[model samples]
Target chain A: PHEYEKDGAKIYVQSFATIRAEADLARFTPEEEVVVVRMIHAAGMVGLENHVRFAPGMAIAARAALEAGAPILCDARMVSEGITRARLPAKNEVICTLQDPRVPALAQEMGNTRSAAALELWRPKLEGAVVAIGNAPTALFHLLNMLEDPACPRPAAIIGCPVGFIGAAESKAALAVANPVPWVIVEGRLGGSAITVAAVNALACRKE
Target chain B: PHEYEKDGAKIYVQSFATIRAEADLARFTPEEEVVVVRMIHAAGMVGLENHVRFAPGMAIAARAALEAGAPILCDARMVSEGITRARLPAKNEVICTLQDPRVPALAQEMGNTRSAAALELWRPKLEGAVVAIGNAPTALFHLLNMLEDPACPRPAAIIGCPVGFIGAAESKAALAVANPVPWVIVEGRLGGSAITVAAVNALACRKE
Candidate 1:
């Protein structure tokens, strides 16, 4: 079920594992999101936990999948407002990098709202955000129909990676299953650059 | 089904909306897990990754739980053979603070090896020394059984929580369909130390 058609911009699907003194869960992904907090741009609110055994310092693990060349979208919209300067500038570079014809772009609008609902419902205002836990995908799809002046775009790529949290294990799978948008499921718990870049990079190219 | 036997841990059979993020996966207690590792720990698998999204990095994220008082276990038999002593020590400490319950207890052994295989099947060797994925209860139950032997005293917790992975999404719920545990499933992706510690500590005091 792997597919990619984007260049630098792609979706990274990753998951991490939650383990404890006695039990183990699958894998999970962390939540070091890169939000699109450019004024009234982004939107969304998202949602958590398990475990068994393994090595020490075993936190929520991470899993990732990315389409090649496709643009990278950051949804660092925590309950707090989103971060714009960091997000918009990054998206700009990401978009510029994907000069390839095959690679598509995921429109992102960095936001920094307070209300969870606002974060839950804004559009371009809310593009490429990994909001809501467990069934966040269902909510994400809703955004596709509601973002950017109401004609929001589907995920050219959506990386709902909440690094080091339990959501990594399941959210992307649910989102991908909801529909097929050259998706990948990276566990949020896998540490930086590895999954995010790898997952997106892989998906962006293969969709070709 | 809700019951609190003696100490203080109250057991409940509830719905899915309980959890909030990856770190939240640790909320599942006695039946769930305390720690979850994303890496194979042995031979100085030094420390966490730079990015907060990889397995190693998630190890760092799982720290919140360990700080609260819980044991963590990883599956692989090698600790970043690549990590350095000076720098690695700091990073490993971060991991140790969470994974290694005996933080500063340098005398402790962290990684596992194929040589540790004491049983006919590799299962027994890694029996109490495993890193679990997804907070899959049934899978967790199996891990719980690992402690029954009494041979291994360490808490084979889900050191690294694999909160949102497919198994976690289905298994935990399936657990409800089949049997049930006094637990809470995180929202699939949100990072925090409170909920997990609350759950596990909640379980420790809870009795049947």
Candidate 2:
């Protein structure tokens, strides 16, 4: 008695069509709209569009970075895990150092969350990479500070939507204010690996 | 300067304390409240408590099953990946068959989503196992039908909070109406791997 959409392709088609019909897309550019739609699909909340904030050229910049074979630096394993490898235009490397043996010691030494400490390991690949922070506000905050250092490399785009009640909103507000790089972010405590991965995938799969 | 709470232990302690202060926990038992709190923490929505439905002694039942070394059967790789292995008292095996080579062909044969077809592989361990469906409503629907077969083994507990616009509410409503097993569900289009994994982890970490 399965009445729901069983076929995979049709389910996606129907989901996108329904989102387009119900959600307000007028505010976003055509490319930006795709990421917002995917975010809504990922979070199952049409109203999520209200909380989303995009840097002027984020969608285009992220897509171009993906096309250039930029590795994706994720703060958490879940974010990296959610990214669809097949959708990556360049077969880009998806990296997460949260589970690295060095992270615990680094975090302890820095007196920061392991998530934020993980970004330290991302330094080598930071330049021109597409960075995604989906689990920790601390990671997003640390990344912003890292951008201030002349020695640290600037990423091409940042997807910084760390979900939580404590510092989630503050970190994202900082990102919006700093505007150091092209970024896509949820402006409050309403993001997770799924939403971040959706934005990354949508950008990666963009045509032209 | 990172002003936010960077210590991991403090983060969990503060997160749970905040959930308790902000969310209404009067409806749940002491044990059940823990699961609800974890759910709220995962979703970062205090109102998530309103949508949670527990099938009587689900928390206790799920905990007992875990203590008895029950494997966790996950509908998606994300659910399995989100589960904290060390928190599981019995070192229970966390399993997800969605990536199994057989799933694609089975879904084609069954004319259903690969998620639903994946459950077929769960039949052997279905008995006394904790079933978690976080990404696909079709899998939950397939699970309920399987439970009625009599040939399929009865699971010790089910955490069925698959998120999406299509068939999510319908499948969960069916579960609430059927009430065939001790279950925990978010009764709308508001579930995903994080929420499901939180419930499982909370139950696994239960002291009693």
Candidate 3:
């Protein structure tokens, strides 16, 4: 049988050992450490831990929400596609509205990017959902603004780590300070769909 | 208007300037620099250049094939979804056989991962196609083995960067030395769909 057919227990054991030895993980709690390890594994850079930040208790909040069957609202198709559906404890619905027929007209009307405008479609399912924004910085910015409105339903937890040179650092910096909900973020401009997926999977697959 | 609504010329100018100033890009050719910058931007790590390797003329070969309408053969759906379709000069067809109905049975028969077995369905379109492997090391390893058979059709170019702690480094090391065709690779475990998408988009969007 190929290695892929097996349970990959040895792979996880070796990878965790290497990450523990090479990475500085003193700042994180055990639960947070698990998420950090997965993110590092996703990017293949142990130094990734240096940029990761989360609101206190974020891992527990995310895990609890996911285990309760919170739908995942992804900012892009790539993020939705990257998630390991099999790992979700609740078999949560994963949604991306980027290709919705109404997005283009809505974007033009709002004078925003399609990705940012697509968040409107998420309103119905926004409450207690896990929001994952991994590609467009505009989507993160828009979501932050949306949260300020009393009419907007709040997400249970947010994984907002958008990757790009333009607006990425600024949007994440805002997320760090605005912390309206439990959140995990990669500070600066170093995040993508893979990192976001790793964080979600870690939270969803928590054994405790 | 939101910044996303505007053309990103200024964004590109600023990003490229920043990458050139902060990173040691002296070893790569001008064409290769474009691809490197995209990969760095994708991962948000300037130090990523340390691991990138390419066969001579890889950038040129990849660009020419893409411009001539060569199809892109992606190992994962994430890679297929990440590519910027508007950037392709010839509007090349992007293909991923991972979800084929026959793939599950084929994988079981071959005693390999589904991702690796998916390549078997790609044989008809492999000739002169651009091969992009970004998630599974098994897929890259399987492709390499398939290429060794004289009956296998040669791809025009290969972007083989699979990110993981398991077999990722080994598979990429094998690709580095194999040199069956034009290839761009990240030498260690640091790669994902975003990096591969960046490489392909940079090659497709080159002005010259």
Most accurate candidate by DockQ: 2
Worst 10 residues of 2 chain B by lDDT: B1-10
Model 2: lDDT of residue B138:
89
Which pairs of residues clash in candidate 3, taking residues 3 or more apart in a chain or in different chains? none
Supply the global lDDT for candidate 2. 0.88
Q: What tens digits encode model 1's per-residue C-alpha lDDT throughout A1-208?
A: 1111111111112221111211222242222121111000110002111211112111111112121122334332121111112322123223211122222222122211111123233334224432222112222333333433335444343444323222333434444454434333333332222223323322223221
Tell me the lDDT of model 3 at A76. 83
Q: Give the clash count for each candidate.
A: 188, 0, 0
Chain A TM-score for model 2, please? Answer: 0.97
User: Which pairs, if any, clash in model 2?
Assistant: none
Q: Which digits, one per residue and each the tens of the lDDT, describe model 2 over residues A81-156?
A: 8888879999799999889999888999999988889899999999999998888999999998888888899999
Docking class of 2: medium
Chain A structural similarity (TM-score) per candidate? 0.31, 0.97, 0.94
lDDT of model 2 at position A132: 89
TM-score-best of 2 and 3: 2
Ranking by TM-score: 2, 3, 1
The regions of model 1 sitting more than 4 angstroms off are A1-68, A74-135, A148-208, B1-14, B17-68, B71-208
